[PDB]
Amino acid sequence: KASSXA
Amino acid sequence: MGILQANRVLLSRLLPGVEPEGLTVRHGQFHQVVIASDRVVCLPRTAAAAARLPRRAAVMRVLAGLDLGCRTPRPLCEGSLPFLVLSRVPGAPLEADALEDSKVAEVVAAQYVTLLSGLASAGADEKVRAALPAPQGRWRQFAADVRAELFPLMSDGGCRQAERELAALDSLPDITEAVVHGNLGAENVLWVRDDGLPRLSGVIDWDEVSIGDPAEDLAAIGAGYGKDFLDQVLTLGGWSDRRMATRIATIRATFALQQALSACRDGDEEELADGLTGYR
Amino acid sequence: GILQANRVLLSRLLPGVEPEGLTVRHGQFHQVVIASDRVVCLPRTAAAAARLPRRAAVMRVLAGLDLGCRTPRPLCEGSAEGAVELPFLVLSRVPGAPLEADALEDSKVAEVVAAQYVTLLSGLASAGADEKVRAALPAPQGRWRQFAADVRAELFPLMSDGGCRQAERELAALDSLPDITEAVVHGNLGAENVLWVRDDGLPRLSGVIDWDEVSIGDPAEDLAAIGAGYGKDFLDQVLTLGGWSDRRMATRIATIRATFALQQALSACRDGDEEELADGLTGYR
């Protein structure tokens, strides 16, 4: 559960 | 009211003598997190997140006993509205700029390897496997959610490209080898600086943690710091085989859609727009 | 001296850090080099090096206990526990500072400090009833009898006749102590090893350091340390709050407490800390 592109 | 005033009884008990209005609250997805000097207090928003919080505490306990070469947020206190107090990991993120010093890059790459190795080794431990989430077909679930929720927001060419990326995902073996942070971006890795070269202090934001495929964490690192640095980590750690590279690239290519998917659900139009760039 | 002798290794473990800027705590087996964020155990002998694998395991076990606070977390990889010996062991450094006694003269502070001690000691007690913990930690038998022997052998030669007579009466009661192996026992829980954050409010327990003497043992040993440091009123508050104010426990504490300066002296003697030996031997020479 990559947030803002990670 | 305000969250600090609202939760003041608990805060006076957990942080005796600490002025609540001098605290900060980080507005998390599931948890309202009150930030004190050396610890945080996690408060659930939903009754869902309130229900899960006991298991979260158990998960953090397990993480606090692993050998990762660094600190994690250690459970100091849990109870009841449920709450969980975690130790606060010291240090700040490393800006990509620092990696332009090759001797910094070497030392930072080395400590990432230790961390990733520690996570890898931990996945073999059955104790860990018992306590941590280990969902199957997480990627086919993701794909169905993208098609359902995101495809309507996309252009024709957008949908075609995404379908290509979601196809690649079915090529991936559903590996559950390692402990996987799941969101191992730059902001979640904290360092001690201005005392010689950077030393890894610890890792935070374990909300997405699971038993899974380590390529996910490696992808996250490369997203934050670029191809050269990831290559450095992959070489030092002996993870530079084609098989790994394919999984990393496949996972990496989903990052914009992941951001769009979660920004769609929580009505964050800035993140959604950014996530859908090139897909519409 | 130590920092000098180990310059090369320390420049590997702490790159870019000036070794002169570091501090040293002397141990029986290891010299402990203190950096800003971490601590490096350097073995004094081959024997000491052979002990560090087990020490790594012990510290990992402690890092997993529910104590309400931090402990020095091992920064090696888990496989280090399988080694025959290690040339060093790096641990996380617990933040904060000791609480000076006079802080406890405020009664609200004392309540809050006592309660956190209780959380710590309660966590240690329940862990000592855990089979896997008990299997991982040392649990010597007849330690009191042997301790008295060690004092007589190693410290009496440094004492006056008056001092030896004082010690003898203190060692006297030890042989009739019940030999209790029920709690995880720090074994050196003086104020200097209990670290607090007191920036944003009343003192908050940050964590506990210097677990060199940790074992499965008698919780009265840790309560004695507290009593020696802070005196009867504060101790009694901990006992009341923890549910440990019964006559048996209080008696064991009194007996052990009478030996605590000797324990510090014995340790200082073995680890070559002349200042802590002088303090420990106060009124014994």
Residue numbers in the entry:
A (entry chain D): 1 to 6
B (entry chain A): 1 to 80, 87 to 286
C (entry chain B): 2 to 286
Paper text:
In this study, we focus on a resistance gene cph, which encodes a phosphotransferase (Cph) that confers resistance to the antituberculosis drug capreomycin (CMN). To confirm whether proteins in cluster I also confer resistance to CMN, three proteins, Cph001 from Streptosporangium roseum (accession number: WP_012891209), Cph002 from Streptomyces sp. SID8364 (MYT78782), and Cph003 from Streptomyces filamentosus NRRL15998 (EWS93654), were selected for disk diffusion assays.
Based on the disk diffusion assay, E. coli harboring cph001 are resistant to VIO but not to Kan and Ery. Consistently, Cph001 is only capable of phosphorylating VIO, and thus Cph001 confers cross-resistance to the CMN analogous antibiotic VIO. Based on the disk diffusion assay and the couple enzyme assay mentioned previously, Cph001 confers cross-resistance to CMN and VIO. We then solved the crystal structure of Cph001D189N-VIO. The complex structures Cph001D189N-CMN IIA, Cph001D189N-CMN IIB, and Cph001D189N-VIO revealed that CMN and VIO occupy the same position with a similar conformation; the pentapeptide backbones are superimposed well while the β-lysine moiety is located on the opposite position between VIO and CMN. The β-lysine moiety of VIO extends into the α-helical subdomain while that of CMN extends towards the N-terminal lobe domain. Moreover, the additional hydroxyl group at the capreomycidine moiety of VIO points towards the protein surface without any specific interaction. The complex structure Cph001D189N-VIO supports cross-resistance of Cph001 and provides molecular details of VIO-binding environment. ITC analysis revealed that VIO binds to Cph001 with a KD value 4.18 ± 0.68 μM, which is similar to the KD value for binding of CMN IIA.
